[PDB]
Nucleic acid binder design. Sequence first.
RNA 1: AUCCUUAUGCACGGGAAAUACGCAUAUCAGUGAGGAUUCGUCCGAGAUUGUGUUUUUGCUGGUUGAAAUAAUUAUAA
Lengths: 142, 97, 757, 210, 52, 71, 105
Amino acid sequence: ASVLLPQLRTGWHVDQAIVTETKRLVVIRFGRKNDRQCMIMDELLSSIAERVRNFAVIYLCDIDEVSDFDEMYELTDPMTVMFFYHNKHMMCDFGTGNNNKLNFIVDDKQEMIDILETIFRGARKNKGLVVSPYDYNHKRVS
Amino acid sequence: DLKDVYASKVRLNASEREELALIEEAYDNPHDTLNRIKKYLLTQRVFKPVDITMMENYQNISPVYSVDPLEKITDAYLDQYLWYEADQRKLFPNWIK
Amino acid sequence: SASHILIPASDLSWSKQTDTGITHFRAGMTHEDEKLIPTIFRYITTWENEFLDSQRVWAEYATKRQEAIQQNRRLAFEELEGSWDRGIPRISTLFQRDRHTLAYDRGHRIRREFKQYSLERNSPFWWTNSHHDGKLWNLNAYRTDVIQALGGIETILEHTLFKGTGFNSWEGLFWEKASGFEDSMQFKKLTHAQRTGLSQIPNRRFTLWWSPTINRANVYVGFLVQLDLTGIFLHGKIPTLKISLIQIFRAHLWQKIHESIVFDICQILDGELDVLQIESVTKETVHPRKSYKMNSSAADITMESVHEWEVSKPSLLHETNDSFKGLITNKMWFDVQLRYGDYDSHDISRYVRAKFLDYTTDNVSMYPSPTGVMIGIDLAYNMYDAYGNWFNGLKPLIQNSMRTIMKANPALYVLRERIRKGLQIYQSSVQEPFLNSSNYAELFNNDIKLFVDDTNVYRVTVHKNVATKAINGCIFTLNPKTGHLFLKIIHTSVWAGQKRLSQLAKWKTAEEVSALVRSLPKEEQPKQIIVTRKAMLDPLEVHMLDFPNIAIRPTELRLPFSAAMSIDKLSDVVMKATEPQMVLFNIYDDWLDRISSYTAFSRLTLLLRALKTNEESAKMILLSDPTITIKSYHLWPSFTDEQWITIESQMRDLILTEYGRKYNVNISALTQTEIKDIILGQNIKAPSVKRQKMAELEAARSEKQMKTKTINAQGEEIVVVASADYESQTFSSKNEWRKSAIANTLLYLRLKNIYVS
Amino acid sequence: PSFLDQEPPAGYVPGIGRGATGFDDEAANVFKTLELKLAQSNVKRQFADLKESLAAVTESEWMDIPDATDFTRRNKRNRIQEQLNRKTYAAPDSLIPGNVDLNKLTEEREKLLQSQIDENLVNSLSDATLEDLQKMRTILKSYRKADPTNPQGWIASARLEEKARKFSVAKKIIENGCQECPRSSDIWLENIRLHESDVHYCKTLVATAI
Amino acid sequence: LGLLPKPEPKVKLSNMMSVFENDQNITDPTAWEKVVKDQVDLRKRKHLEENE
Amino acid sequence: QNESTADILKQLPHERLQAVLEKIPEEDLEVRRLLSILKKPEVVENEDVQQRRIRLAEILMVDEIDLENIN
Amino acid sequence: KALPIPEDQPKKKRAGRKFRKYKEKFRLSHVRQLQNRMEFGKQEQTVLDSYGEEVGLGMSNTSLQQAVGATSGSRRSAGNQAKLTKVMKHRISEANQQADEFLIS
RNA sequence: AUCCUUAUGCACGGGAAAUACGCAUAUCAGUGAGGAUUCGUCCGAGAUUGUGUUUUUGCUGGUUGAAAUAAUUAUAA
């Protein structure tokens, strides 16, 4: 990570990065970037980024310089992953209980591509919430 | 013995379809197949590589040796023949199990 | 089960819905009386017993073999009955027919025992073979004794919603397997996510099937949320079950069922009228959310009386000894309260009782009269019950009413049908695909096959009912490709039995097909046999057990072959024939040489359809031209080619003429409807009145993009609310001003005949 | 990269920028002081001194590096394994495990072998289910009660329920059918065959049969 | 773009039964026979006129 | 209308070649001579005169040079 | 290489002897569908292979057929029948040519 | 002038497959790619790499709860 994955500098880079892309699916992340949990998600989202390039897209967002979106999206967390399509928050249903964002790490590349594909499906179908193919009940639920 | 594995699954993949195709051609042309088998036993000393998946029992693993289904025919017929002749001529004493 | 499993009295009891009433069979199982899921240990036989058993059955087998050698007779299977299943190996694998080749197979124990390194998938049955040894375990008793171990099939079903699928009993129902749908849709270009979420279907089918006992207050004991726009209470949250239930209740099916049942009762009362001494039957205008609003209720049907009524104490739809002198009421009200129950709440009678008492007695729920009947239906279990104040004459006709509604209701069959589509349950019908316009595209695969028509096997002619005499029958089976016609001549004396003529005609006809196909060699042996009528498929298969390789196809196409006895010489040789005679006609000769077999069969089908529809005309076209002659061995009126074109066109004009003149429809239609008219029409498939009304209920309001004032009850509140959609179903049939006032015009007709005693 | 290079124009307080959705002093200092008073690798270093041993590499050597060139060729082999896993197929209709037998199989294809050479010169099925056998019994009851005079009526149901029941019950309904039939000899032949005795019962069968 | 006429189906004696696009395939059986046989013999005769 | 059928049809590679085939005269010595001067192979394995003309057209299409440009 | 954009398409229709053969090898045949259909009340007919006992026949066999236990060949589709690949057809052609060479020698 | 052999193109027809068919400002290749063997030697054409489509490519037909009846103006007051 921090090579292929563009790192958004400030809240203006976050906002503008979300607003610019109508066609692709904006995937923003937020993490202390020194933390193991968000680091794993980064090194996953590098290869995942290369695979989902054509449709989805990945953007690195630390919470260091940006405290803005924490008050908005209720972010503290070790890490969070946010999704946006047509400048609209894409709600993702896992078995964690948090439909808005996913705070949990996934270890399978093909899986991450599967959930990005899924939220892309519901996204184009315009549905606000899409049901993830997997559960993640007992996995993390942090 | 080679079709024992494929009688179950309703959905065959490519390699399985190649093997089953070879076997069906072996039923259709036994003379051409048997002559193809005797030819390999007398001649070829050089064979194609073997890709290996791992059998995983969680107690211990390895191996699974997956042979090109063409050579699998010759090895199967040769095996059956050696067991028929060996058990006919009592090569293996009774104590071998 | 490998473990100790006790079945509490919690899930045992099974209830049954009968026309005589509702019956309940309760567990009452305590202490010494209990049921237990049988472990395998009771079934699998111990080794030592199996080996002593083995040497015993091999010894007795050797003795019986020696005796059979003494008397010079081969060992019989059924004389060798007793133990066919005992020994290692089993005596069955001595009498298996492949014993020769498998006997030429050696080294198999070490081969398969050593096979784990060749293959990938793990099957730990390696320690034996089914061929050389046998079936070393019989679990067929386990299934039967687990079925019997739980309450019987009926008790297994009570935990399911099968009752809601609306079948009288399980007979021909079949399932679509998990790998069935997963493999069915597996073939397509799909992303891995589409593959997984698309493979998440089977456990949704399973979740829905056992959903009544899967979703239960006793099980979850947690927050209870009501599913949107429905009457279901979901204990806990099951993401699969929620999507399945929404899918079943799609497009306001709940309120369609409520309004439909209420409208049913209204349509019945509009005939009940004076017979029940009714002043008026008025369907109230109710808020749409009331149907699925369980908190509060209201009277669905207000019933106004001519005179005062004597109503009895609150009772049940099926009861006895009801004294109606208890109370007097001017007004009556019906309430339809629908519920989707689980296994614990399965009882409809107690529910409707307690709820009736609640709504009538207390809180917000308002009724125009203190006396009324609350009707209710449990959709999952398809149960129905009515609890309330009854008056003389009402109860029996409401029993027949609810019986008719449960038997056939449009909305209820929409529910049952959507449930069947959710569970992939289907009635048996026929395994082999029917022959319709689509399959008729290819009747020639180069695979030889026959057409069988038994319609004419039994013929009795009547003149002016003064004279009824039997006619020699026939069995009509043709092969289009070769053109040959196998026609059997049945003799009248064969019917001297004169008992079960229909049952005998079918078996006797199937006999001819059997002996016929058996008479044909391997080359001409038909791969398929298409029966015109759908009866013979049951008789034939019995005779087809001999050669399994040949498939029987019943045709929805209605073939003219029933009228094949109309041809002049073909009918003459049958009457002139005496005894049963299997005769070979060549019905394709001239144009078998001239034109292709398919064209031959289409034009012959045309001639026989015209000949069936109008006999005299079709004969008039053939014998009309004096110049043409009918040769003896040709049997058809041999023409030139263009003449065949004209004659066939005239036969078409005959079929369309008598068709449109009889069924009185102008002939334009379309080319496709023209085809299906000449040949089949898919057995003239018409969706019935039911299927029409239900096709209306299924269809969504085509274009999504009046207002009624209503008083509604929020939580601990009463609020006037403007409503929408359809509350507008109204009965008002024989009553008020409209029907009687319109009926008044006919009153001058009542004085045409005037008489007094 | 464009928006990344554009830089923020001061700031838009982005919370309201795109319309994002949310789904004394001395005292504070004192309580902070109270919170304070009450509140009171190696191989990486090898990477660091190796990083210091890097210094001998000049920038002209940096501008030239042999990028990529994966020696495992997992790109090709990944493409080939992918091509192999794209599709699969449906198994043919010969894999339904009826299997026929190695008798019809071997004696079937060995005559094909001899033909080619001359040109160059119950099975494993589960036990019959009771309900199915009930359908058998009903259907054959119908075909028997149709014409009792038909010998093949009691012969077809004879063998056919004879396989299902295997027992003297089916053998008995066969015998009664022989009582209805008798004028046909075939039912007596199949009758004797379906009885197993050397002398006692079968000789009586022959006596009545003749 | 529509400069050429849309091609009809190419009938044969085997494709005879299976082509419903043109009419009369059943409705007018022998006339249809003349259409498919005349069309096949028309392609063959056009081939011979090409070689000639 | 926009993108006229004549513009798309002329833009089509085959028809754009066929328009050039109409500009070339058909003669044995002149067709052959243009190949000889053009240095392309004078005769291919087996070709009819029309096929040689087609090779003219193709070579003039790929090289982006016309007959007036050559001579 | 990035995955294609996950958009649904009608995928047209097609049909025809050509495409019904090529698509016929992929589509589940009628006997495979009948095998995927399993009866409600009775235990489905199950062939236990020497490899495994898990194979059911579902409803593929008729009732009567299931009582006699002869199974069937029923309708035999030669379209979905397994066929060799191109490389294997070529390699077997070489094997049979060489085999005839050793028959000559 | 007739007949015949090889190759090419044009097409009638008959089939088989598409897990195959391609493309390349790419590398190498009869100045030998790639393989066989009886150990003597024999065959001689693509191989490597990347990439597109590939349960398919372009069109049609039918069935269908997928869906889609113009304007105008006349009474005695």
